Every structure is written in C-alpha cells, then in structure tokens.
Design a binder for this molecule. Structure first.
Ligand SMILES: *[C@@H]1O[C@H](CO)[C@@H](O[C@@H]2O[C@H](CO)[C@@H](O[C@@H]3O[C@H](CO)[C@@H](O[C@@H]4O[C@H](CO)[C@@H](O)[C@H](O)[C@H]4NC(C)=O)[C@H](O)[C@H]3NC(C)=O)[C@H](O)[C@H]2NC(C)=O)[C@H](O)[C@H]1NC(C)=O
Ligand SMILES: *[C@@H]1O[C@H](CO)[C@@H](O[C@@H]2O[C@H](CO)[C@@H](O[C@@H]3O[C@H](CO)[C@@H](O)[C@H](O)[C@H]3NC(C)=O)[C@H](O)[C@H]2NC(C)=O)[C@H](O)[C@H]1NC(C)=O
Ligand SMILES: *[C@@H]1O[C@H](CO)[C@@H](O[C@@H]2O[C@H](CO)[C@@H](O)[C@H](O)[C@H]2NC(C)=O)[C@H](O)[C@H]1NC(C)=O
Ligand SMILES: *[C@@H]1O[C@H](CO)[C@@H](O[C@@H]2O[C@H](CO)[C@@H](O)[C@H](O)[C@H]2NC(C)=O)[C@H](O)[C@H]1NC(C)=O
Ligand SMILES: *[C@@H]1O[C@H](CO)[C@@H](O[C@@H]2O[C@H](CO)[C@@H](O)[C@H](O)[C@H]2NC(C)=O)[C@H](O)[C@H]1NC(C)=O
Ligand SMILES: *[C@@H]1O[C@H](CO)[C@@H](O)[C@H](O)[C@H]1NC(C)=O
Ligand SMILES: [Ca+2]
Length: 964
C-alpha cells in the first residue's frame, strides 16, 4: 500500500547518516576546532561587558553632540551681535557686497549691488563634492531677487559669520555643514560648494524640517477647509494645493486634523479627533482633501463650533500646546462673534484666516477674526503664492519663544533625513537667532519679536556608527538608538531610501522615519523594551526571540540579551543587542615580525593556488588603505601595506590587522594540512571556510568564480544563520536567476565552528560544503526504493508516475525531488509547486508563518509585505491525510535529526486534482497597515515638554489686514 513508518524512519536515517558524515568528514569541522585549540598562546579571550560598552558608546555620542552644540551656540552669539551692530543702508555702490551665490555658471565670461566671486574647488573625499574652505556660499531661491535692499543688507551682516565658520572647522575638523537659514530666504553654508545639478530649483530654506523645528514649538493644527458653491472652480483647486503644501510643513511632533463645512461640519477623512503628522497620516489627509467637493451654503457658526470642540478633545495624545486653527475660505459676511465669545474668551487658540483665489467677496470679516483671535491674515491669489503664504505662520508662532529671552535657545536635533547636498543620512541641530537691535538700551521692541533665522550643523550617521565599533562582537550583535518618538537613529536595517507611503499609483524631501518595531515586532518583550528606552531608563533583558535572516527568507528562534542606557544630556537612548555566545571575543597577540611574514605569504595573488581563492573583508585597517568594491584590489593593497609597514605603529588599527592575519594563518594551515590531502571527493563541489575576522578561502580554483557571497564576513546571511543553530544548516539556492543555478555551483551546507577556551564558549568560524546536485540525485533514488517490493512502485524513482518524494528545508524551499520537472525548480518555494500540501502542512502546524512589512523598498509600477516559514513543533512523527479534492493522499513527514531538513512523501499531485490558489512567499507590493485602526491604538511616545505658546508682552498689532 504505502511505505510504513519504520521504512520511512530507516530511509531518512540512512540519508541523514550519509549527508551528515559527508559534511563532517569533508568540511573538517573537528579538524579546524582542534587547530584553534592547539594554536593557543597566540591570542587571548576578553569579555564583552555590555554594561560598559553601551556606557562608553553613549558617552562618545554625548561628546560628539556637545561638540556640535558649542559651534551652534557661539555662531548664534556672533550672528546676534553682528546683526545688532548693523546699519540699514538703502544705497549701494553696485560693488559693495561680495559673495558666491552658489548657483552661477562657473564660466560666464562676462549685479545691481553685488560683485561675484570666482572660487577654486579642488576636491574632498569627506563630502564627495568639490568644496572650498576660503569662504562660505549663499543660496538665494529663484523666486527672490538677488539684489533687493533687504537681501543686500542681510549679506553685509552675514558676511561676518565666515570667520566663525572657519574657526569652528579649525577647532573640530570633522564638521560637515554649518548652515544659517534666514527669515528672508537666503542660506549661508560654510564649505563653498555649487548647488545641486527639470533643473528648476524649488529649494527654500524656510521650509526645510530643521528650520521649521527651530522656528517654533509643536503645534495642534486643525485645518478648517470651506466647501461651498462659491469656492467651486479654480478656488477649489487652489485650496486643495494650499492645504497639501501647508500639510507638508508639519513635523512628527505636530498633530493635525483636516475638517470641512458647507452647512454642517464633518471630518474629511476617517480620522475623527487628531492624528500625529506622520508620513502616513499626512498622505491620508492629502488624499481626503484631494477627493473633496463644493456644495451648499456656508455656515461659519457651525464650522468654528466644530473646530473648537475637536481642539478640546483630551482623550487622545496631542502636543498639548500651540492650539491653532486655519480657515481656508474665499470670503463672506458673517464674523460669528458669539462663537468666539463662547469658546475663546481667554484667547488660548490662535486663528489664521486665508482668502484663497481671485474673487470680489468681502474679506473684512475674516481679517477681523484674524485680528481679534490672536493670529494673522493671508491671501493666496495664484499658485505661485501658495508656498510663501503657507510658510509664514511660523513667524507669528515664534513670538513667545523670542520674548522668553535666553531660555528658548536650546539645541534640538531633527529626525534622520537625506541631505539636500547629496551627503546621505544626516541629522541637524538647530538654534534660533534673535533680533536684538536696541536691546542693551531699552528703546526698540517693535520688531524685536521675530527670529532672524535658525542656525544648523549637520552630523552624519557615519560618525555615530564610527563611535560604536561592531567588530569585537559577533555578526548577530549590533547597536541601535531610539528618539522619544520611537524612530531609530542607528539600526542595521535602516537604509538610505525614503520611507514608502503606500502602493505606487500608476502614471527625497521627506524624513526617513522608521520605527523601532519595524525590525521584528514581538508583543511580549520588544514593546516593553521600546517603552522603557523611550522613557529614559537603563536595564537588561535576556529572552528567547525570533530573528529574521539577512536574505529575508529564514527565521531562527535565538536567545538575545537587550541592554540599554540613555544618552544623557540629549533625548536619544542607546541599546546593545548581544546573543549568549557572543559574550567573549578572541584578541590577537602582538606576536613578532616573523609571524607577520609567513602569515602574509599565504594570501598573495599568485599564491592562492594551493590554498584556494582567498577573500578579505573591506574593513578599514589603515588610514592610507582605501576600501574597494572589487576584492582583488583590496587584497593587493592589503598585501602591499602589510609588507611595506608594520601593522601597529603607523597609526593603524593593530587589533584588526593582527586578528585578520591570525585568521589567515589558521585558515591556511587548515586548508593545506586537511583539504590538500583529498583533492577530489565524490559528493562535494567546493570546500569553503569563513571566519570572524574577514577572510574566506574557497579551496577549488574554478569554484571561486561561483562565490556570490558578500566578501564582508559580518554581512553573510549563511554565517549569521549558522551561528544561531547548534547543528548543520542547509541554504537553499536561488531560482530563475541570471546567476549560476544549483547544477554547476551546488547546495550550500554550513556548520558553525565551536571552541571551548577555558570553560568559556566561542564560535569564531563557520565551515561548509557545496554539495554536488547530480551525486545526491543518484544517491536519493537508491537509498529509498526497495528493489523486490511490488509490481506497482512502493517508492519513487527517477521518473515516478504516481509516487511523489520531495525533501524540503525549514523555509519551505525545495531542494530535491524524484521528478525531473520538480528538480528543475530547485530553490523554488514549495508552495508554488504543490500549494495544497503546503497549506495542509501549515494547517497541521508544520511550517509556522508570520509576516513583516518592508517600508524601504522599490516597486516597478513602496510598502512591501514579506513572509517567512519555520519549524514550530520540534517533533518527528507528523503523519496525516490530506483529503484533497475527494482524492485522499496519505503523506508521511520525517525530519533529519542532525540537519534542518524534512522528508515529506505524498501519494501524488497530478493524479488527484485540487485547488491551486498559489501560496507565494515572495515579497508583494501592498498597502501597509490601515492608518485609521493604527491611530485608534497609537504607539507609546513622549513629546517634548518645553513649549512657548503665550506671553502677555507679545504685540498683536501686526494683523495683516491693515498692513496691505
Ligand atoms: C531687526 O529689528 C530692527 C529694528 O527693530 C530692524 O531695523 C529696521 O529696519 C527697517 C526696515 O525694515 C527700518 O525702516 C526705516 O523706515 C523708513 C520709513 O518707513 C523706511 O523708508 C521707506 O519706508 C517705506 C515704508 O514705510 C518703504 O517703502 C521703504 O522701506 C522705504 N522707502 C524708500 C523709498 O526708501 C526705511 O525702510 C527705513 N529708513 C531708513 C532711513 O533706512 C528701520 O529704521 C530699522 N530700525 C533700526 C533701529 O535700524 C531690522 O531690519 C531687523 N532685522 C532684520 C533682519 O530685518
Ligand atoms: C557692508 O558694506 C559696508 C560698506 O562698505 C562695510 O562697512 C565698511 O567697512 C570698512 C572696512 O573695510 C570700513 O572702513 C574703516 O572704517 C573705520 C571705522 O572704524 C574707519 O577707520 C575707516 O573708515 C576705515 N578704516 C580702515 C583702516 O580702512 C567702513 O567704515 C565701513 N562702513 C562704510 C564704508 O560705510 C561692511 O564691512 C559690510 N558688512 C560687513 C558685515 O562687513
Ligand atoms: C472621552 O471624551 C468624552 C467627551 O469628548 C468624555 O465625555 C464622557 O463621555 C462618556 C461617553 O458615554 C460619558 O461618560 C459622558 O458622556 C461624558 N462624561 C462626562 C462629560 O463627564 C469622556 O469622559 C472621555 N473618555 C474618558 C474615558 O474619560
Ligand atoms: C548620564 O549622567 C547621569 C547623571 O545625571 C548618570 O547617572 C548617574 O550615574 C552615576 C554613575 O555613573 C550614579 O552613581 C548616579 O546615581 C546616577 N544618577 C542618577 C541615576 O540619577 C548616568 O549614568 C549617565 N549616563 C551615561 C550613559 O553616561
Ligand atoms: C508571529 O510569529 C510567531 C512565531 O510562531 C507566533 O508565535 C506563536 O504563534 C502561535 C499562533 O500563531 C501561538 O499559538 C503561540 O503561542 C505563539 N508563540 C509564542 C511564544 O507566543 C506569533 O503568534 C505570530 N504573531 C504575532 C502577532 O506575533
Ligand atoms: C570634541 O572636541 C574636542 C576638541 O574640540 C576633540 O578633542 C574631541 O575629540 C571631540 N570629541 C569627539 C569628536 O567625539
Ligand atoms: Ca460661500
């Protein structure tokens, strides 16, 4: 009938024995272990005190941020003093102001008051661009004239900042950028570089997120759009565009909701109270306002009574300060005094009124509302005025923090965002600058309640990664830092790409905000740990977690130890993740000049012939040594460096070089002594070895070309996978790819090398075997079938018409099968080939599944969904009946004990028809979580506590109605 359980347990046992014996006696795990023990005294074991490493890194980050803050402080002081000393000239001799303008052609071969500079740019690898240190540059947006009186008057008093720009760089050479945004629109950054290279420049320094952060406090904005018969036509389009643009000026710390009202007010989107101005909530609001219609007869007394009620809802999270209402209308006759006298007598809610479009309605009432209720009045007559008339409310909002004196001047760091000058991921510290003309003597306070601008220095994430070395840990260990909003500052899965917002509809300005829980969301532990780090505490938590493999196909149930501590002085919280086996590391010895010689004579370009092709990790060892994408150039440069100097003395990383050469010696001794004895083996294609220390040695010469793995050891998916497993790990290859398939490269199986120095545990290397496909094909069809069993086939064969015999891994990917058509699809997900059996396996809990969302992904027409499968029963019997399509197929599943594979044998697939409903495991473009449900249960966050939203000294005469 069907093969018995004992027959299956013998067949799988024999296949196990064969594969495990071949892997153990071919890859030489025990031999390499013995080599590591018996070459002791060349290295020492050192602890990884997480409680000390995280503290040291936190202090380093604090010192970096204090260095970058002192420059801002002194720059702000100098700018304030110079502006106080300035004189308002209204007549220039056409050559009195001198600057670069950073946007002119370098070769004009040819103004009202300015004389241009022809500078010299050489190069700088620190920036990638061409820079000049002799002077700063100026960026004046296209819309604004470069020769108006106000611009030239600013150019004079901002020319003085160049000396301080130079001085700060002289103190700390690592400064990247030092920008001074101005309230008039121009910006001055110290390293003089041309502006960015369809080329119409829409940049405006008064709209960048750092300027907006430093110019005011977190807001509670409620946009009150007016829908009516009058606003139909062009006015509606202008209102739509204006609402979108003004939404673009909000930040993560700000809460916003959009309402509309023709005769009874209603929410324009699913949100009902208030939502954080994330990159998703803003998109939802933009779509809702873009799907709006104009009908009915305007009723202000209901719209305002609705807005004031939604600004009083305290059941939800909000910034709890700067409660401001925006009215986008055209014009009317009702001023609604009763509503304001009912809701806002103490005047705690600001009202800004906008008169959008070209009309002839009475604008008087809206100016009156903007005057009585503390605010300002705007007009948008065309598309070109939307940007300016929507970016100006920060000028009104910044008055109370100006009147606070030298108390609102605190350095505040922004979110991670891509630099405008193509520098990668950077964060910016902002410090406002106040107008203090006539401050020493008490005469002038008329215009002294507006900021001059916001200073800013950029620090790259590369510096912060430099402050947190990761080469003394295992590849599974890393650092990460979280701001109070939950977003990651450092994390290995944070990449320089904009955050996806939804499905890419058919037919670089946004911040890169990735929450911590978008690494592997675990309800029990990684939520409480996140909430503790956000609160600003320190602790340790050892727990059994799930880690997603680097290739994003496998999941391991490993043990990790989360240690965190706050970065005191700032708001970021640093944490360090360490597994149990990474509590110790091998520190190489000084050895002697002789050891360097023969440890270097192993990895020469002409020499990897009897030792196998040798890789090297592009880790910066020496300052002169340069990282190269191609491994051969790095190998040659490393050889010439280690030949030409000693490692330690010439201001190089002694530990890194010493450990690399120690690994080279150990691996060379291993490959020679053991692998050189047996040149060819029946079932292996390539013997490889990867060690912590950035060296890889594929023994066969012709097999070195097929090595598609990353030369960096700490970024190999198989290495990290094998580190977390105490047994042999089988890596499924790729299917339908332009590279070599699993017929000339082989199947990769790897085992983690384990050593016991003293009593401590260490896993410094991973060895493995590339299994020949054809040998295992001819071995699989003779150890499974009984010869004199029956007329009908009891088991499978090379072409089994009925019986199906496949072997899988712990990720659902197929490795072998009896049928030629099946084995032609090696590495393919078994759900695609046989969906019904996979679905039944999942239902009877054979492969657990749990999915994640990838936000930094690109799509061909974007958020992307992912799925990974693994074991969840750690048992062997696993017997059941499909009952598929009224054609029952009895199936038996057995798992090879030492390896991570499972042997599942079904009666047949083609004979019994079933539904297909293909079970795909590949990434699919899809919308993320529903924003409405997400905001119904918001995540934990801690908003800033400082806020300046009211002051009795503030002057309210500047209403905007009488001023134009
Ligand atoms: C920081 O604050 C200080 C003061 O607190 C500020 O300095 C003041 O700047 C204004 C210009 O914005 C000067 O205004 C004077 O007023 C006269 C009279 O109005 C102006 O002359 C004409 O004014 C009309 C409008 O009234 C206008 O068309 C145009 O400005 C002028 N027209 C013509 C044809 O000339 C001048 O603007 C100006 N007078 C002179 C002689 O320059 C104040 O005098 C300044 N106050 C002080 C004490 O210096 C300073 O700008 C603020 N910082 C920044 C960056 O703006
Ligand atoms: C904006 O343009 C202004 C006009 O040119 C500049 O102001 C001028 O700078 C000159 C220096 O190059 C001054 O000359 C000196 O002033 C001192 C005053 O203490 C006097 O001894 C002399 O006039 C002169 N001395 C020497 C040794 O040359 C001008 O007085 C001064 N003002 C003018 C010409 O009206 C500003 O420098 C420029 N803005 C900034 C921020 O520099
Ligand atoms: C949520 O906000 C509402 C008003 O915005 C608060 O008002 C209460 O609503 C519940 C709902 O049935 C009732 O107890 C009363 O209608 C209200 N109680 C009053 C006015 O005292 C409500 O209290 C808020 N939620 C919580 C949990 O406090
Ligand atoms: C940041 O500074 C604070 C001080 O405000 C540190 O907290 C103190 O740490 C010392 C030992 O380092 C303890 O003796 C004190 O009791 C701590 N004071 C507390 C907890 O209020 C904190 O350790 C520093 N953190 C880092 C990462 O440097
Ligand atoms: C995410 O995947 C994990 C991996 O199994 C799930 O953990 C188990 O899930 C099953 C049901 O899906 C439960 O019966 C088990 O009790 C879970 N194990 C533990 C230790 O909790 C998890 O449920 C999946 N879903 C979520 C939201 O995490
Ligand atoms: C901070 O600045 C001082 C001097 O300006 C410098 O010696 C120190 O290395 C800096 N710390 C950093 C860059 O972490
Ligand atoms: Ca109307």
């Amino acid at each position: 009938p069907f093969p018995s359980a004992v027959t299956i347990k013998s067949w799988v046992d024999k296949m196990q024995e064969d594969l495990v014996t071949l892997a153990k006696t071919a890859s030489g795990v025990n031999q390499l272990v013995d080599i590591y023990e018996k070459y002791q005294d060349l290295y020492t074991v050192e602890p990884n005190n997480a409680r000390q490493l995280v503290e040291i890194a936190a202090r380093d980050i604090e010192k970096l941020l204090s260095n970058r803050s002192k420059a801002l402080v002194r720059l702000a002081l100098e700018a304030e003093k110079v502006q106080a000393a300035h004189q308002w000239r209204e007549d220039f001799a056409s050559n009195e102001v001198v600057y670069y303008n950073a946007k002119d052609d370098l070769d004009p071969e040819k103004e009202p008051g300015s004389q241009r500079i022809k500078p010299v740019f050489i190069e700088d690898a620190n920036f990638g661009r061409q820079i000049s240190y002799q002077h700063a540059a100026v960026h004046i947006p296209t819309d604004i004239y470069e020769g108006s009186t106000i611009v030239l008057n600013e150019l004079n008093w901002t020319s003085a900042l160049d000396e301080v720009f130079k001085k700060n760089r002289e103190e700390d050479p690592s400064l990247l950028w030092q920008v001074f945004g101005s309230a008039t629109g121009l910006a001055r950054y110290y390293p003089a570089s041309p502006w960015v290279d369809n080329k119409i420049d829409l940049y405006d320094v008064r709209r960048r997120p750092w300027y907006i952060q430093g110019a005011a406090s977190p807001k509670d904005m409620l946009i009150l759009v007016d829908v009516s018969g009058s606003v139909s036509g062009l006015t509606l389009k202008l209102i739509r565009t204006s609402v979108s643009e003004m939404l673009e000026t909000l930040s993560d710390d700000d809460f916003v909701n959009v309402a509309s009202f023709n005769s009874n007010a209603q929410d324009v989107s699913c949100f009902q109270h208030l939502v954080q101005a994330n990159v998703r909530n803003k998109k939802v609001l933009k779509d809702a306002v873009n799907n709006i219609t104009a009908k009915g007869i305007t009723d202000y007394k209901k719209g305002f009574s609705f807005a004031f009620e939604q600004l009083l809802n305290y059941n939800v999270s909000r910034a709890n300060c700067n409660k401001i209402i925006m009215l986008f209308t055209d014009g009317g006759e009702e001023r609604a005094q009763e509503i304001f006298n009912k809701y806002n007598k103490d005047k705690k809610v600001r009202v800004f009124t906008f008169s959008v479009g070209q009309h002839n309605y009475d604008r008087g009432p809206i100016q009156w509302m903007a005057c009585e209720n503390k605010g300002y009045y705007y007009e948008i007559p065309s598309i070109g005025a939307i940007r300016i008339n929507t970016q100006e409310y920060l000028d009104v909002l910044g008055r109370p923090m100006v009147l606070a004196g030298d108390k609102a001047k605190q350095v505040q760091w922004t979110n991670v965002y891509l630099d405008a000058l193509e520098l990668g991921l950077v964060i910016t510290g902002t410090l406002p600058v106040f107008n203090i003309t006539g401050q020493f003597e008490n005469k002038t306070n008329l215009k002294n309640q507006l900021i001059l601008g916001v200073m800013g220095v950029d620090v790259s994430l590369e510096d912060i990664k430099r402050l947190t070395p990761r080469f003394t840990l295992c590849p599974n260990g890393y650092y990460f830092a979280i701001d109070p909003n939950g977003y990651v500052l450092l994390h290995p899965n944070l990449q320089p790409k904009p955050i996806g917002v939804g499905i890419p509809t058919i037919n670089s300005q946004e911040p890169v905000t990735l929450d911590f829980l978008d690494a592997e969301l675990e309800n029990d532990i990684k939520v409480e740990i996140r909430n503790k780090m956000i609160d600003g505490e320190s602790g340790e938590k050892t727990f059994r977690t799930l880690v997603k493999s680097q290739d994003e196909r496998y999941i391991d149930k490993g043990n990790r130890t989360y240690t965190w501590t706050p970065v005191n002085g700032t708001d970021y919280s640093l944490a360090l993740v360490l597994p149990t086996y990474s509590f110790y590391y091998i520190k190489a010895k000084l050895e002697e000049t002789i050891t360097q010689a023969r440890y270097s004579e192993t990895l020469k370009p002409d020499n990897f012939e009897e030792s196998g092709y040798t890789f090297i990790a592009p880790r910066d060892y020496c300052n002169d040594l340069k990282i190269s994408d191609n491994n051969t150039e790095f190998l040659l440069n490393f050889n010439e460096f280690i030949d030409r100097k000693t490692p330690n003395n010439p201001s190089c990383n002694a530990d890194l070089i010493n450990r690399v050469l120690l690994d080279a010696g150990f691996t060379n001794e291993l490959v020679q002594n053991y692998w050189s004895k047996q040149k060819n083996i029946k079932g292996v294609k390539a013997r490889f070895v990867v060690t912590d220390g950035g060296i890889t040695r594929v023994y066969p010469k012709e097999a070195g070309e097929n090595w598609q793995e990353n030369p960096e050891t700490y970024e190999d998916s198989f290495y990290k996978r094998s580190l977390d497993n105490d047994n042999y790990v089988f890596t499924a290859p790729y299917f339908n790819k332009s590279g070599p398939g699993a017929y000339e490269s082989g199947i990769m199986v790897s085992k983690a090398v384990e050593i016991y120095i003293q009593g401590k545990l260490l896993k410094p290397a991973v060895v493995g075997i590339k299994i020949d496909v054809n040998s295992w094909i001819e071995n699989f069809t003779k150890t499974s079938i009984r010869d004199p069993c029956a007329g009908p086939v009891c088991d499978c064969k090379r072409n089994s018409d009925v019986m199906d015999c496949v072997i899988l891994d712990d990720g659902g990917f197929l490795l072998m099968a009896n049928h030629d058509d099946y084995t032609n699809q090696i590495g393919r997900f078994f759900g695609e080939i046989d969906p019904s059996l996979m679905r039944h396996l999942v239902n009877i809990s054979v492969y657990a599944f749990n999915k994640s969302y990838d936000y930094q992904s690109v799509c061909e027409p974007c958020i992307t969904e992912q799925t990974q499968y693994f074991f969840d029963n750690d048992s062997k019997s696993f017997s059941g009946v499909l009952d598929c399509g009224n054609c029952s197929r009895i199936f038996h599943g057995e798992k090879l004990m030492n390896t991570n594979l499972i042997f599942i044998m079904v009666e047949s697939k083609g004979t019994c028809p079933c539904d297909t409903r293909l079970l795909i495991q590949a990434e699919q473009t899809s919308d993320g979580p529903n924003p409405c449900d997400m905001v119904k249960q918001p995540r934990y966050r801690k908003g800033p506590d400082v806020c300046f939203d009211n002051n009795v000294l503030e002057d309210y005469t500047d209403c905007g109605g009488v001023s134009g």
